[PDB]
């Protein structure tokens, strides 16, 4: 099976909503070792965000249940949570490894470097959500440093209305809010990202949607 057919199979999986197949297709595209196109980079990202998104959402349900029980029901919920966590960990480590071996080193443009550093940020951030252990501090710091370098390249190299730059601001601010527990820094990062895009006002739809999500977070975190 060649790159072209793996890519077409991935787009079939996507439309069938079969996100596990889609991810294995894009992973083996990435393991061929050549720099991904935009469309190629997008498909991989969409695939894994659905795969890891489902475990995240199940993790939250089963950990809430485990927190709100006062039996042997508790031990069951705890052991189901742990099983979900280990699937979640294996998926994150798969993605981080593609990132460290082939996506980040091959990225020849700034836009691409920022996309993939953001993504490394996100996937350490998901590990951080379920790694309250003594390994949490080192995970959180891996997340922060990928985002931080993304942030500095995007600020030098991209306009305030670029969707990749706007998206990075959105998720970095979420990271400050939920992982570092620094609401002030979360809010001021999101606020300036929003005001700088507004000032620069583009060739649109995806930018203005992330602007809305920035401001919704600002509205939530301020009450």
């Amino acid at each position: 099976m060649d790159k072209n057919e793996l890519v077409q199979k991935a787009k079939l999986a996507e439309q069938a909503e079969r996100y596990d197949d889609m991810a294995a297709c894009m992973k083996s595209v990435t393991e061929q070792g050549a720099e991904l196109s935009n469309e190629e980079r997008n498909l991989l990202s969409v695939a894994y965000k659905n795969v890891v998104g489902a475990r995240r959402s199940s993790w939250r349900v089963v950990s809430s249940i485990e927190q709100k029980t006062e039996e042997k029901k508790q031990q069951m919920a705890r052991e189901y949570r742990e099983k979900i966590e280990t699937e979640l960990r294996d998926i994150c480590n798969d993605v981080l490894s593609l990132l460290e071996k082939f996506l980040i080193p091959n990225a020849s443009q700034a836009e691409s470097k920022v996309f993939y550093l953001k993504m490394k940020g996100d996937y350490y951030r998901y590990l951080a959500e379920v790694a309250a252990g003594d390994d949490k501090k080192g995970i959180v710091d891996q997340s922060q440093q990928a985002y931080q370098e993304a942030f500095e390249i995007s600020k030098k190299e991209m306009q305030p209305t670029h969707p990749i730059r706007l998206g990075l601001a959105l998720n970095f601010s979420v990271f400050y809010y939920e992982i570092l527990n620094s609401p002030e820094k979360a809010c001021s990062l999101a606020k300036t990202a929003f005001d700088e895009a507004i000032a620069e006002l583009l060739s649109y739809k995806d930018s203005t949607l992330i602007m809305q999500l920035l401001r919704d977070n600002l509205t939530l975190w301020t009450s």
Binding site: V46, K49, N171
Partner: peptide, 11 residues
């Protein structure tokens, strides 16, 4: 693909 999926937006 649309902004929420391409960029893996959190909430």
């Amino acid at each position: 693909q649309g902004x929420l999926d391409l960029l893996d937006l959190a909430s």
